[PDB]
Write a protein that binds this ligand. Sequence first.
Ligand SMILES: *[C@@H]1O[C@@](F)(CO)[C@@H](O)[C@H](O)[C@H]1O
Length: 1025
Amino acid sequence: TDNPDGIDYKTYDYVGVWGFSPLSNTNWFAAGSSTPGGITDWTATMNVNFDRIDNPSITVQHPVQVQVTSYNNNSYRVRFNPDGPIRDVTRGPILKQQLDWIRTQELSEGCDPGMTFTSEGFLTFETKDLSVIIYGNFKTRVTRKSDGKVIMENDEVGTASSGNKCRGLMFVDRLYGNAIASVNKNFRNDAVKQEGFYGAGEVNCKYQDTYILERTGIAMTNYNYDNLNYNQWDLRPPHHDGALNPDYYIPMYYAAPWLIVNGCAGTSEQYSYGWFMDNVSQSYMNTGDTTWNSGQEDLAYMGAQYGPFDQHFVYGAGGGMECVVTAFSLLQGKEFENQVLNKRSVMPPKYVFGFFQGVFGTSSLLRAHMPAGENNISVEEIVEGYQNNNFPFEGLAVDVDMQDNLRVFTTKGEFWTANRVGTGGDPNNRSVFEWAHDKGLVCQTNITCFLRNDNEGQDYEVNQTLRERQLYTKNDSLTGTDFGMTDDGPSDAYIGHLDYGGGVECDALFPDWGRPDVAEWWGNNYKKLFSIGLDFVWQDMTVPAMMPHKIGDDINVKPDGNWPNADDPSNGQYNWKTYHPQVLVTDMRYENHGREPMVTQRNIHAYTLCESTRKEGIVENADTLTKFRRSYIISRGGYIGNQHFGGMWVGDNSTTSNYIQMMIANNINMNMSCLPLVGSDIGGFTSYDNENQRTPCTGDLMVRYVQAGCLLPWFRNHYDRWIESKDHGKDYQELYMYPNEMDTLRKFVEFRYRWQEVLYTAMYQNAAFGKPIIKAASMYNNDSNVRRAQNDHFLLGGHDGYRILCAPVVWENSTERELYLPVLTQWYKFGPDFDTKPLEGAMNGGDRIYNYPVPQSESPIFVREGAILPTRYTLNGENKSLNTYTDEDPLVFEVFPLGNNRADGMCYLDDGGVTTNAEDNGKFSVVKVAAEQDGGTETITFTNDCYEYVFGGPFYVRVRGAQSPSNIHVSSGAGSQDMKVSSATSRAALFNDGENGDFWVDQETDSLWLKLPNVVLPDAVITIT
Ligand SMILES: *[C@@H]1O[C@@](F)(CO)[C@@H](O)[C@H](O)[C@H]1O
């Protein structure tokens, strides 16, 4: 039954950060006083008296829960509901079952937060490193035990004569609105603390000409949006004139109400903590922005258009911002389901780390069946171009082009080898996906939840069963709004419009996700694609991203590009490029709880789509998958918690230097919002040349794009292609189309391929421990200079996740950059060339190099001392896809020069996702290695933490800076032997002809290679004298 809490919904339209202003006080309640309401488990209740700040005699009472969530990881939670009872969400990143599991574990270890009400009514409690006090009006001080330092405090506002009111807890009188807010003191301007705020999902922020990482001193909003180019005109500030650049006040595709605050950076007294307002209505994060009077320099807040109020403060276990990220990912963890592998996120197939190509505007599988049309291309041509030119190349992102007339889950004849649709498994009529398997590729295909509704009487089973089973969103509201209607019906359906431009368009119905039965119906449609050879999913238009529309207009008519605007507001008539926000949706937050207008829950839609694809598509129907039983999702939208469904790409970027800068910042920020497998379209998706949209990306920009993206988790070149029947886009963008740059393009893809295990093992570090793959420079501790370098330096890889430094050039036509090397370690220049020549001399960390040289053919990438990295090569020397590697393609442990006479490395091994036995049954291995120099003796030790996956071929150790040994001894469960010099005199010969127990003195790269049998991998001691 609709609106069960009896809310009066006051706001439906978007409200920019210019119109959200808690610090203006008027009509806001804040916390005035309280009394104790008891403690159950680790949850204290305070009965709080809220007073109206501009009239403190107007008062209301609500219960406020304060809960310790983790003692060891120093986290706690504050929640209340000004609109009804406090309720646990049944879907979302934070679930009570996980909180319960964490509390049960810590209790069994004797953790005691000692939560107590003092006799004065104040609440006090401790965690491992912290001590908290909450006074009568909710004024809060969080103190660090070791030094006494106050690391966080909430904000109070004075009144004329009625006492101080605490702005830590705020909500708008329900006579006037529905918003909520929470305000902290912000020490950004403090000379010593110099607080900086980080995180926030996909927000872009310009400073002068450059896009930057930090999110200090700015007003932001989470409001999932079809935001092509990151600067959609309807998102402009009131009365904005001239061009709109992407910038901090524009919402993006991923909803991330999450910041990590970092102060006293680089000193022994650094502190960090993360702040999450777990709300799925439009939310706001202001880190001290005066613009529009939205906030105040010395305060920070989070808020949202709708309740309930639920926020988490996360300080982490160890020192540094990375520890904040690992603790956040624990709160969202699946330890409560006893995951043997997928604890903090879900492991992809190895092939997800390959190089992919998407094209929007292919018109067939084969050249033989391609319809004639200016600039038409076949999938076949694309594969040829990469394969004939020896690119490492994983396969394809196959767009809505392959579908029958935009009906999702269909294909058309042109995308089969015999030019007609079959049901799969016919060797004389292969699907695009079957044909791609025979080329050694895998594919994703674009799926959205628009179910085409205008079918001209033709049969489309997906839409028909959605109808028949009453599973679509209805056209109901509390406002009597008329969302529109077509001749197709049904008469009570919400009907939207999908618009790809250039006439590529249709009417659609949508699944009402919170209804029981919907998630299962949806997952089952994927059988129709899995059984014809599809490997993984590309999840698009997820807001869901509807054609812009105004109430009263026909379903297929959009308003003037300029509307709405300040002089002519939406006034409850614009759809804000998704559902008209008054539509009653079955509640996605709370099961079996009724319907609410979509305005209350916008930012949960993408998350729920992905969830349903993951559980009911990929997992439930895993039997219908052909070549790889493990699969994955790469989604355009979502909410905090998406890492448990798959990874992300940052939608529709463009082809300029600024988009490279944004790609890098987005990747780092998304990693710290616990979404690690993320990327942006390499080369930019949209056209960029205003005098002729068809102009391709320049050679030099593509090189820089590829260089910047090559060690980022998701690596796909994808673009809008101009073709006769879809006349927007660029002519081409494929790497093989760049003859002058081909050699460079190719060698950075090879470089990535060699480090496939670095990426895959970082991914395991994330699934298991929650460590971000990509590290912000400021995650590197005891360094006072990283913060300056942080826009375009990042780190990754190796046993701790900090063994590789990247500082890619972020400007076209530029052959130098300012380089900063983190201090108290030594660095070695590396990159695609260094595989086949010696290292250069050590570079001293803490060095700043102005105008450091960077030819187009190079990019700045450094390997830290003490690193041992797993590295892969093809046995034959040809470039192949990841998914066609076997254990006979060499695994090689490269030992870089030692740090303090030591080096360390880790490697995760499984079958790559051929089966799901690694995550279902524990079938994986984790090998560690160490090297120690002690006088004239070097010892290299291999150990395992589990060895449940048997690596099937020989493996190597490549020691850099070593030459001829006097003797090498290997000890291992399988007894022990001395090694002998190989008869092989080259690397290809050692790989193919060399015997197990052979070593090779590689003078050309100044390396010693040792070849070892597979049985000594899990446990060995190697003594080099
Ligand atoms: C979804 O939309 C398309 F289908 C067409 O623009 C894709 O090619 C895009 O990458 C994605 O945003």
